[PDB]
Amino acid sequence: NGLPVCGETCVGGTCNTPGCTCSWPVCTR
After folding, report:
1. Residue 26 to residue 7: CA distance in whole angstroms
2. How far apart are CA 21 and CA 3, in angstroms?
3. Would I find Signal among this entry's keywords?
């Protein structure tokens, strides 16, 4: 939801993980 602690990235625009908030370069929660 903003916190850059998703642990996943989204260089393609798809965190690939749920309950995430792709913010680039890394998604957030």
Report:
1. 8
2. 9
3. yes
CA-angle at 13, arms to 7 and 26, nearest 5°: 25
Contact between 5 and 15 under an 8 Å Cβ cutoff? The reply is: no
d(CA 1, CA 20): 7
Measured CA to CA, the distance from residue 23 to residue 14 in angstroms comes to: 10
Number of CB atoms found within 10 A of residue 25's CB? 9
Solved by what technique? NMR
Identify whether the C-beta of residue 19 lies closer than 8 Å to the C-beta of residue 13: no
